[PDB]
Amino acid sequence: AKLLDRQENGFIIEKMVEEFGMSYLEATTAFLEENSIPETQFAKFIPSGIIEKIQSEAIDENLLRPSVVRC
Amino acid sequence: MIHIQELACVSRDTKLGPEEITADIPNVGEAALSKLDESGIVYIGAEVTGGDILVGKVTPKGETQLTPEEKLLRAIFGEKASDVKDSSLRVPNGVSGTVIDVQVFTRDGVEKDKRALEIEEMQLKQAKKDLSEELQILEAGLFSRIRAVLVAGGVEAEKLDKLPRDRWLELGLTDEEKQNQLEQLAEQYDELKHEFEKKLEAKRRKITQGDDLAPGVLKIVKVYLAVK
């Protein structure tokens, strides 16, 4: 009944990037959808370790306003 | 052959919020954003080619249009992350030339950016300067004559040149049509000096005051490109 353990979910995530070879972003965007978790709750279900690897994609891909890249 | 092609970039109010003219544009490399000034506008004298950004504009996206992939990173980075889409004004395909002028019009009410202010600030220094030199002439002139007419009739030759210029208007002369001359000079000076001053006003009024643009439009940036 409890998914809480992020580490768990985190290890569970990179599994998808290793197999489905999708973008860390798309991946974790999906993981959430599949478990019915709103993005606004990513904090309690996603490991801040895997987040970092999204932040990285965002910059490398310029998905964000230069304004936010800096801070 | 050669001609000045006027290209405009307009930012309006949308049903989804106000547009922004800025260098803070997403989905474009440093290469593109590099060539722009702090205000998102291209540099005068730039050798621009088809595609290059001339004026950076941005438009709010609105829920409906948000991919769940961006709803997520919006939640990660805060509201103003993937808030807007690039709608900046680029150089059309095929065309090539060199920017020779830009012209920023801002509606009455909108906050003036840094770029705008410096320009505003500069035009004030002048409007003011223009007055000093205007006034210096007015004095140097009329006052050369007041002396002349003053000396002739009641000469303080050396005495007069000492007391500050503002003290001359004071001194009087033996009743005479020569006192009526000294009368008009006084009137003229003041009346004119005043007029010149209330002109500085009407100038400052215009410089700072907004531009009368269409309803909805917030600011317009007109780039002037020399196409060969």
From Swiss-Prot, chain A:
GO terms for biological process: late viral transcription. Signal peptide: none annotated. Disulfide bonds: none annotated. Residues 31-61 are annotated as: Interaction with host RNAP. GO terms for molecular function: transcription regulator activator activity. Transmembrane segments: none annotated. Activates transcription at late promoters when the sliding clamp is present. Binds to both the host RNA polymerase (RNAP) and the upstream dsDNA. Belongs to the Tevenvirinae late transcription coactivator family. Interacts with the beta subunit of host RNAP RpoB (via flap domain). Part of the transcription activation complex containing host RNAP, the viral RNA polymerase sigma-like factor, the coactivator gp33, and the sliding clamp. The C-terminus is involved in transcriptional enhancement. This is Late transcription coactivator. It comes from Enterobacteria phage T4. The lineage of its organism: Viruses, Duplodnaviria, Heunggongvirae, Uroviricota, Caudoviricetes. The chain holds residues 32 to 102 of 112 of the full protein.
Swiss-Prot record, chain B:
Disulfide bonds: none annotated. It comes from the Bacteria. The modification N6-acetyllysine is found at K193. Acetylated on several lysine residues in the presence of glucose. Co-administration of salinamide and rifampicin or salinamide and myxopyronin suppresses the emergence of resistance to both antibiotics. The RNAP catalytic core consists of 2 alpha, 1 beta, 1 beta' and 1 omega subunit. When a sigma factor is associated with the core the holoenzyme is formed, which can initiate transcription. The rRNA transcription and antitermination complex (rrnTAC) consists of RNAP, NusA, NusB, NusE (rpsJ), NusG, SubB, ribosomal protein S4, DNA and precursor rRNA; S4 is more flexible than other subunits. In pull-down experiments interacts with CedA. Belongs to the RNA polymerase beta chain family. DNA-dependent RNA polymerase (RNAP) catalyzes the transcription of DNA into RNA using the four ribonucleoside triphosphates as substrates. This is DNA-directed RNA polymerase subunit beta. It comes from Escherichia coli (strain K12). The lineage of its organism: Bacteria, Pseudomonadati, Pseudomonadota, Gammaproteobacteria, Enterobacterales. The gene is rpoB.
